[PDB]
CSV table of C-alpha atoms in Angstrom, one decimal:
chain,number,residue,atom,x,y,z
A,3,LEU,CA,29.9,13.7,9.0
A,4,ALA,CA,26.6,13.2,7.2
A,5,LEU,CA,24.4,10.6,8.8
A,6,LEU,CA,24.0,7.5,6.6
A,7,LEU,CA,20.9,5.4,5.7
A,8,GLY,CA,21.1,2.4,3.4
A,9,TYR,CA,18.6,1.7,0.7
A,10,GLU,CA,18.4,-1.7,-1.0
A,11,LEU,CA,16.2,-1.7,-4.1
A,12,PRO,CA,15.9,-3.4,-7.5
A,13,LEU,CA,17.6,-1.3,-10.3
A,14,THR,CA,18.2,-4.3,-12.5
A,15,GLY,CA,16.0,-7.2,-13.4
A,16,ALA,CA,12.3,-7.7,-14.0
A,17,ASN,CA,11.4,-5.3,-11.2
A,18,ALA,CA,13.9,-2.5,-12.0
A,19,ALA,CA,11.1,0.0,-12.7
A,20,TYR,CA,10.1,-0.1,-9.1
A,21,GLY,CA,13.6,0.6,-7.9
A,22,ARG,CA,13.7,3.6,-10.2
A,23,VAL,CA,10.6,5.2,-8.8
A,24,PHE,CA,11.8,4.5,-5.3
A,25,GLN,CA,14.9,6.5,-6.1
A,26,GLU,CA,13.0,9.3,-7.7
A,27,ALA,CA,10.7,9.6,-4.7
A,28,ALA,CA,13.6,9.2,-2.2
A,29,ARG,CA,15.6,12.0,-3.9
A,30,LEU,CA,12.7,14.5,-3.6
A,31,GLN,CA,12.1,13.7,0.1
A,32,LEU,CA,15.7,13.7,1.1
A,33,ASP,CA,16.5,16.9,-0.7
A,34,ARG,CA,13.5,18.6,1.1
A,35,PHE,CA,14.6,17.2,4.5
A,36,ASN,CA,18.2,18.4,4.2
A,37,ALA,CA,17.0,21.7,2.8
A,38,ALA,CA,14.9,22.1,5.9
A,39,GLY,CA,18.0,21.7,8.1
A,40,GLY,CA,18.6,18.0,8.2
A,41,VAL,CA,18.9,16.6,11.7
A,42,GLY,CA,19.7,19.6,13.9
A,43,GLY,CA,21.9,20.9,11.1
A,44,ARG,CA,23.4,17.6,10.3
A,45,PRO,CA,22.6,16.4,6.7
A,46,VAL,CA,21.5,12.9,5.9
A,47,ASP,CA,22.7,10.9,2.8
A,48,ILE,CA,21.4,7.7,1.4
A,49,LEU,CA,23.6,4.8,0.2
A,50,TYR,CA,21.8,2.8,-2.5
A,51,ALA,CA,22.5,-0.8,-3.3
A,52,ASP,CA,21.1,-2.7,-6.3
A,53,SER,CA,19.4,-5.8,-4.8
A,54,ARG,CA,18.3,-7.0,-8.3
A,55,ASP,CA,15.2,-8.3,-6.4
A,56,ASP,CA,17.4,-11.3,-5.6
A,57,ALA,CA,17.4,-12.9,-2.2
A,58,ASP,CA,21.0,-13.9,-2.2
A,59,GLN,CA,22.1,-10.4,-3.4
A,60,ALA,CA,19.9,-8.8,-0.7
A,61,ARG,CA,21.7,-11.0,1.9
A,62,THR,CA,25.2,-9.8,1.0
A,63,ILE,CA,23.8,-6.2,0.8
A,64,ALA,CA,22.5,-6.6,4.3
A,65,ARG,CA,25.8,-7.9,5.7
A,66,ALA,CA,27.5,-4.9,4.0
A,67,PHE,CA,25.2,-2.3,5.6
A,68,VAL,CA,25.5,-4.0,9.0
A,69,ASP,CA,29.3,-4.0,8.7
A,70,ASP,CA,29.3,-0.2,8.0
A,71,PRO,CA,29.0,1.5,11.4
A,72,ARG,CA,27.8,4.7,9.7
A,73,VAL,CA,24.6,3.1,8.4
A,74,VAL,CA,22.1,3.5,11.2
A,75,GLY,CA,19.0,2.3,9.3
A,76,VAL,CA,18.1,0.7,6.1
A,77,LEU,CA,15.2,1.6,3.7
A,78,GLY,CA,14.4,-1.8,2.4
A,79,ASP,CA,13.4,-3.5,-0.7
A,80,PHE,CA,10.5,-3.9,-3.0
A,81,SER,CA,9.3,-7.5,-2.7
A,82,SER,CA,8.2,-9.2,0.5
A,83,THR,CA,10.4,-12.2,-0.3
A,84,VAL,CA,13.6,-10.1,-0.7
A,85,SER,CA,12.7,-7.8,2.2
A,86,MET,CA,12.4,-10.8,4.4
A,87,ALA,CA,15.6,-12.5,3.2
A,88,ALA,CA,17.5,-9.3,4.2
A,89,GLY,CA,15.2,-8.8,7.2
A,90,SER,CA,16.4,-12.0,8.9
A,91,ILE,CA,19.9,-10.6,9.0
A,92,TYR,CA,18.9,-7.1,10.1
A,93,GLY,CA,16.7,-8.5,12.9
A,94,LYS,CA,19.5,-10.7,14.2
A,95,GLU,CA,22.1,-7.8,13.8
A,96,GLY,CA,19.9,-5.0,15.3
A,97,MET,CA,19.4,-2.9,12.2
A,98,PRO,CA,16.0,-1.1,11.8
A,99,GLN,CA,14.5,-1.8,8.4
A,100,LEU,CA,11.7,0.1,6.7
A,101,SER,CA,10.3,-1.5,3.5
A,102,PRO,CA,8.1,0.8,1.5
A,103,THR,CA,6.1,-2.0,-0.1
A,104,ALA,CA,6.7,-5.4,1.7
A,105,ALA,CA,3.0,-6.1,2.4
A,106,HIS,CA,3.1,-9.8,3.2
A,107,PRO,CA,1.7,-10.6,6.7
A,108,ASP,CA,4.8,-12.6,7.7
A,109,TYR,CA,7.3,-9.8,6.9
A,110,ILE,CA,6.4,-7.8,10.0
A,111,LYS,CA,6.7,-11.0,12.2
A,112,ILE,CA,10.4,-11.5,11.4
A,113,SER,CA,11.6,-9.5,14.4
A,114,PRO,CA,11.1,-6.2,16.3
A,115,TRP,CA,13.2,-4.5,13.7
A,116,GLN,CA,10.9,-4.6,10.7
A,117,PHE,CA,8.6,-1.9,9.6
A,118,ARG,CA,6.5,-1.3,6.5
A,119,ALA,CA,5.1,1.9,4.9
A,120,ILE,CA,2.3,0.0,3.2
A,121,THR,CA,-0.5,-1.9,4.8
A,122,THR,CA,-1.3,-5.6,4.4
A,123,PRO,CA,-3.8,-6.6,1.7
A,124,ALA,CA,-6.3,-7.6,4.3
A,125,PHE,CA,-6.4,-4.2,6.0
A,126,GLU,CA,-9.0,-2.8,3.6
A,127,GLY,CA,-11.4,-5.6,4.5
A,128,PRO,CA,-12.5,-4.3,7.9
A,129,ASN,CA,-12.2,-0.7,6.7
A,130,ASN,CA,-14.7,-1.3,3.9
A,131,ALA,CA,-17.0,-3.4,6.0
A,132,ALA,CA,-17.3,-0.6,8.5
A,133,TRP,CA,-17.9,1.8,5.7
A,134,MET,CA,-20.8,-0.1,4.2
A,135,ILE,CA,-22.3,-0.7,7.7
A,136,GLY,CA,-21.9,3.1,8.2
A,137,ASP,CA,-23.8,3.7,4.9
A,138,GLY,CA,-26.7,1.6,6.2
A,139,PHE,CA,-26.2,-1.8,4.5
A,140,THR,CA,-27.0,-5.0,6.4
A,141,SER,CA,-26.9,-7.6,3.6
A,142,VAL,CA,-24.3,-7.7,0.9
A,143,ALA,CA,-22.9,-9.9,-1.9
A,144,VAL,CA,-19.2,-10.6,-1.9
A,145,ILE,CA,-17.4,-11.4,-5.1
A,146,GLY,CA,-13.7,-12.0,-4.8
A,147,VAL,CA,-10.7,-13.3,-6.9
A,148,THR,CA,-8.8,-16.3,-5.6
A,149,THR,CA,-5.5,-14.5,-5.4
A,150,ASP,CA,-3.8,-14.3,-1.9
A,151,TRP,CA,-4.8,-10.7,-1.4
A,152,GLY,CA,-8.3,-11.3,-2.8
A,153,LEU,CA,-9.0,-14.2,-0.3
A,154,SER,CA,-7.4,-12.5,2.7
A,155,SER,CA,-9.2,-9.2,2.1
A,156,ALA,CA,-12.5,-10.9,1.4
A,157,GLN,CA,-12.3,-13.0,4.5
A,158,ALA,CA,-11.4,-10.0,6.6
A,159,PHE,CA,-14.3,-8.1,5.1
A,160,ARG,CA,-16.8,-10.8,5.7
A,161,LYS,CA,-15.7,-11.3,9.3
A,162,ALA,CA,-15.9,-7.5,10.0
A,163,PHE,CA,-19.3,-7.1,8.3
A,164,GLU,CA,-20.8,-10.0,10.3
A,165,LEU,CA,-19.2,-8.7,13.5
A,166,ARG,CA,-21.2,-5.5,12.9
A,167,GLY,CA,-24.5,-7.4,12.4
A,168,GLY,CA,-24.4,-7.6,8.6
A,169,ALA,CA,-25.1,-10.7,6.5
A,170,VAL,CA,-23.2,-12.0,3.5
A,171,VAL,CA,-26.1,-13.6,1.5
A,172,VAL,CA,-23.9,-14.2,-1.5
A,173,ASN,CA,-20.3,-15.2,-1.5
A,174,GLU,CA,-18.6,-16.1,-4.8
A,175,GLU,CA,-14.9,-16.9,-5.4
A,176,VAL,CA,-13.7,-16.5,-9.0
A,177,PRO,CA,-10.3,-17.0,-10.6
A,178,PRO,CA,-8.2,-14.1,-12.0
A,179,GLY,CA,-9.3,-13.5,-15.6
A,180,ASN,CA,-12.8,-15.0,-15.1
A,181,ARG,CA,-15.2,-13.9,-17.7
A,182,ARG,CA,-18.5,-15.7,-16.9
A,183,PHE,CA,-20.8,-13.6,-14.7
A,184,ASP,CA,-24.3,-14.8,-15.6
A,185,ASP,CA,-24.6,-17.3,-12.8
A,186,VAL,CA,-23.3,-15.0,-10.1
A,187,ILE,CA,-25.7,-12.3,-11.4
A,188,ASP,CA,-28.6,-14.7,-11.2
A,189,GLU,CA,-27.6,-15.5,-7.6
A,190,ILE,CA,-27.6,-11.8,-6.8
A,191,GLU,CA,-30.9,-11.5,-8.4
A,192,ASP,CA,-32.4,-14.4,-6.4
A,193,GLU,CA,-30.8,-13.5,-3.0
A,194,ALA,CA,-31.5,-9.8,-3.5
A,195,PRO,CA,-28.6,-8.3,-1.5
A,196,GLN,CA,-28.6,-4.6,-0.9
A,197,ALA,CA,-25.1,-4.1,-2.2
A,198,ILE,CA,-22.1,-5.7,-3.7
A,199,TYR,CA,-18.5,-5.7,-2.5
A,200,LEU,CA,-15.8,-6.6,-5.1
A,201,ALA,CA,-12.5,-8.0,-3.9
A,202,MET,CA,-11.0,-7.9,-7.3
A,203,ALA,CA,-8.9,-5.9,-9.7
A,204,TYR,CA,-10.0,-3.4,-12.4
A,205,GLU,CA,-9.3,-5.7,-15.4
A,206,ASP,CA,-11.8,-8.3,-14.1
A,207,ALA,CA,-14.2,-5.9,-12.4
A,208,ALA,CA,-14.8,-3.6,-15.4
A,209,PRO,CA,-16.2,-6.4,-17.6
A,210,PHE,CA,-18.2,-7.8,-14.6
A,211,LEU,CA,-19.9,-4.4,-14.0
A,212,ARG,CA,-20.7,-4.1,-17.7
A,213,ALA,CA,-22.5,-7.4,-17.5
A,214,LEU,CA,-24.1,-6.6,-14.2
A,215,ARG,CA,-25.5,-3.3,-15.5
A,216,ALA,CA,-26.4,-4.7,-18.9
A,217,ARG,CA,-28.8,-7.1,-17.1
A,218,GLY,CA,-30.4,-4.1,-15.4
A,219,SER,CA,-29.1,-4.4,-11.9
A,220,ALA,CA,-29.1,-1.0,-10.1
A,221,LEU,CA,-27.4,-2.2,-6.9
A,222,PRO,CA,-24.6,0.0,-5.5
A,223,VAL,CA,-21.1,-1.4,-5.7
A,224,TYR,CA,-18.1,-1.0,-3.4
A,225,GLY,CA,-14.7,-2.5,-4.1
A,226,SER,CA,-11.0,-3.0,-3.4
A,227,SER,CA,-8.3,-0.4,-3.9
A,228,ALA,CA,-7.2,-2.8,-6.7
A,229,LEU,CA,-10.0,-1.2,-8.7
A,230,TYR,CA,-8.1,2.2,-8.5
A,231,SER,CA,-6.7,2.9,-12.0
A,232,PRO,CA,-7.7,5.1,-14.9
A,233,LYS,CA,-8.0,1.8,-16.7
A,234,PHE,CA,-11.0,0.9,-14.5
A,235,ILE,CA,-12.9,3.8,-16.2
A,236,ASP,CA,-11.4,3.3,-19.7
A,237,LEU,CA,-12.4,-0.3,-19.5
A,238,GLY,CA,-15.8,0.0,-17.8
A,239,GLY,CA,-17.1,3.4,-19.1
A,240,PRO,CA,-20.7,4.1,-18.0
A,241,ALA,CA,-20.9,0.8,-16.2
A,242,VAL,CA,-18.5,1.9,-13.4
A,243,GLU,CA,-20.2,5.1,-12.6
A,244,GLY,CA,-21.1,5.2,-8.9
A,245,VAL,CA,-18.6,2.5,-7.8
A,246,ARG,CA,-17.1,3.3,-4.4
A,247,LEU,CA,-13.6,2.4,-3.1
A,248,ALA,CA,-11.0,3.5,-0.6
A,249,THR,CA,-7.3,3.9,-1.2
A,250,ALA,CA,-4.2,5.2,0.5
A,251,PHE,CA,-2.6,7.3,-2.2
A,252,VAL,CA,-5.0,9.5,-4.2
A,253,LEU,CA,-3.6,11.0,-7.4
A,254,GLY,CA,-6.4,13.5,-8.0
A,255,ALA,CA,-6.5,14.5,-4.3
A,256,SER,CA,-7.3,18.0,-3.2
A,257,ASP,CA,-5.7,17.6,0.3
A,258,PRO,CA,-2.7,20.1,0.2
A,259,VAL,CA,-0.3,17.5,1.5
A,260,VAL,CA,-0.9,15.1,-1.4
A,261,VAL,CA,-1.0,17.4,-4.5
A,262,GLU,CA,2.2,19.1,-3.4
A,263,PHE,CA,4.0,15.8,-3.8
A,264,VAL,CA,2.1,15.0,-7.0
A,265,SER,CA,3.0,18.4,-8.4
A,266,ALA,CA,6.6,18.3,-7.3
A,267,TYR,CA,7.0,14.8,-8.7
A,268,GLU,CA,5.5,15.4,-12.1
A,269,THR,CA,7.4,18.7,-12.5
A,270,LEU,CA,10.7,17.1,-11.7
A,271,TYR,CA,10.3,13.7,-13.3
A,272,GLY,CA,7.8,14.4,-16.1
A,273,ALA,CA,5.5,11.5,-15.1
A,274,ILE,CA,2.6,10.8,-12.8
A,275,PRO,CA,3.8,9.2,-9.5
A,276,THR,CA,2.5,5.7,-9.0
A,277,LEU,CA,1.4,4.1,-5.7
A,278,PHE,CA,4.8,2.6,-5.3
A,279,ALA,CA,6.5,5.9,-5.8
A,280,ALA,CA,4.1,7.4,-3.2
A,281,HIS,CA,4.9,4.7,-0.6
A,282,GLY,CA,8.6,5.1,-1.4
A,283,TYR,CA,8.1,8.8,-0.7
A,284,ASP,CA,6.4,8.2,2.6
A,285,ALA,CA,8.9,5.5,3.6
A,286,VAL,CA,11.8,7.9,3.3
A,287,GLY,CA,9.9,10.6,5.1
A,288,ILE,CA,8.9,8.3,7.9
A,289,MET,CA,12.5,7.2,8.3
A,290,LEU,CA,13.9,10.8,8.2
A,291,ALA,CA,11.3,12.0,10.8
A,292,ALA,CA,12.4,9.2,13.1
A,293,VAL,CA,16.1,10.1,12.6
A,294,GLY,CA,15.1,13.7,13.3
A,295,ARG,CA,13.6,12.7,16.7
A,296,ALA,CA,16.5,10.4,17.5
A,297,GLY,CA,18.9,13.3,16.8
A,298,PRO,CA,22.5,13.7,15.7
A,299,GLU,CA,23.7,11.0,18.1
A,300,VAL,CA,21.2,8.5,16.7
A,301,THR,CA,22.0,4.8,17.0
A,302,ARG,CA,20.5,1.8,15.3
A,303,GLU,CA,18.7,1.0,18.6
A,304,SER,CA,17.4,4.5,19.2
A,305,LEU,CA,16.3,4.7,15.6
A,306,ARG,CA,14.3,1.4,16.0
A,307,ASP,CA,12.4,2.9,18.9
A,308,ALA,CA,11.7,6.2,17.1
A,309,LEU,CA,10.5,4.4,14.0
A,310,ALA,CA,8.2,2.3,16.2
A,311,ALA,CA,6.9,5.6,17.6
A,312,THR,CA,5.4,6.6,14.2
A,313,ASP,CA,1.8,7.3,15.2
A,314,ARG,CA,0.3,10.1,13.1
A,315,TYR,CA,2.6,10.5,10.1
A,316,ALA,CA,0.9,12.9,7.5
A,317,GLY,CA,2.0,11.0,4.4
A,318,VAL,CA,0.8,11.3,0.8
A,319,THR,CA,-0.5,7.8,1.3
A,320,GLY,CA,-2.6,9.0,4.2
A,321,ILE,CA,-2.2,9.4,8.0
A,322,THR,CA,0.0,6.5,9.0
A,323,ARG,CA,0.5,4.7,12.4
A,324,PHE,CA,2.7,1.8,13.4
A,325,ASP,CA,1.0,-0.4,16.1
A,326,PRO,CA,2.8,0.1,19.5
A,327,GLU,CA,2.6,-3.6,20.1
A,328,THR,CA,2.8,-5.3,16.7
A,329,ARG,CA,4.4,-2.5,14.6
A,330,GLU,CA,1.7,-3.3,12.0
A,331,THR,CA,0.8,-0.4,9.7
A,332,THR,CA,-2.7,1.2,9.7
A,333,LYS,CA,-3.8,4.2,7.7
A,334,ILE,CA,-6.7,6.6,7.3
A,335,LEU,CA,-7.8,5.7,3.8
A,336,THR,CA,-9.6,8.2,1.4
A,337,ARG,CA,-13.1,7.2,0.2
A,338,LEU,CA,-13.8,7.8,-3.5
A,339,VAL,CA,-16.6,7.4,-6.0
A,340,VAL,CA,-16.5,7.2,-9.7
A,341,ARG,CA,-18.5,10.1,-11.1
A,342,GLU,CA,-18.5,11.6,-14.6
A,343,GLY,CA,-15.5,9.6,-15.8
A,344,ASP,CA,-13.1,10.1,-12.9
A,345,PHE,CA,-12.5,9.2,-9.2
A,346,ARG,CA,-13.9,11.8,-6.9
A,347,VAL,CA,-13.0,12.4,-3.2
A,348,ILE,CA,-16.2,11.9,-1.3
């Protein structure tokens, strides 16, 4: 009698920790949903399956969910690779799939049946370029790591900035773990950009900023959501004060919708929710809301349409929309600044 949703996630293997927080978040959302009355009084239950973050295992799991007529939708997997492996089957079979974290550009292109709760890595590029233009900058220095997300986001940022009339007077690509900053700093000194945009993670950015500030530079710094971690501050100390960044999930948020989840989660699980837990929370909520609109007689086909209709979901990871044409995910990010040892909502 209860409506069924499948959920493939890694509970064993190198990525088991992610499957665990997915389940912790899922439980909270599902319980609230059913407590609220389910779908017109009809409860919803989730059938979990350990994918082990293994493509072949994900494929047999996908066949299994497809073969069970009760399963009308599948919440789906941690990695992009595994999500896509199962995605190929779901697309061909007509099963709507919602991955909370599959961020690879190609995942959404598999078929009209794939959806993601997270945004692609490049999404923050245009967002931050627009932000800096809005703050009055017309010339910037871009420093980015050579990882896939680093290059894609840096390229999207540069393109968006120049589209708005800004100039990238310094553009440096560095490898993960890089520790030499003197040359890039000299280049910033000579070109004199008005600001710096960092397409890199906290472990590399903290030492860079210590070097930048040690040499006396007072230029403002904006950066990737990859800088978002208490470690950014523990590692950079005074040097990271004033750094700006935007992110989907804000732990120290003041927006009622976010802290309620943060509070409920910490109280029930005794630990701070991670960004993965947050996206897992929103993924389940997005799915359930879609089922709610589809109603008790929901089908895989009607659920796919409802999921695609997601336009203004008030998630803990921000207001979320699925493009009516591409199904690509966009979100209203939250701008932050590091001030007095912690991230502050601007």
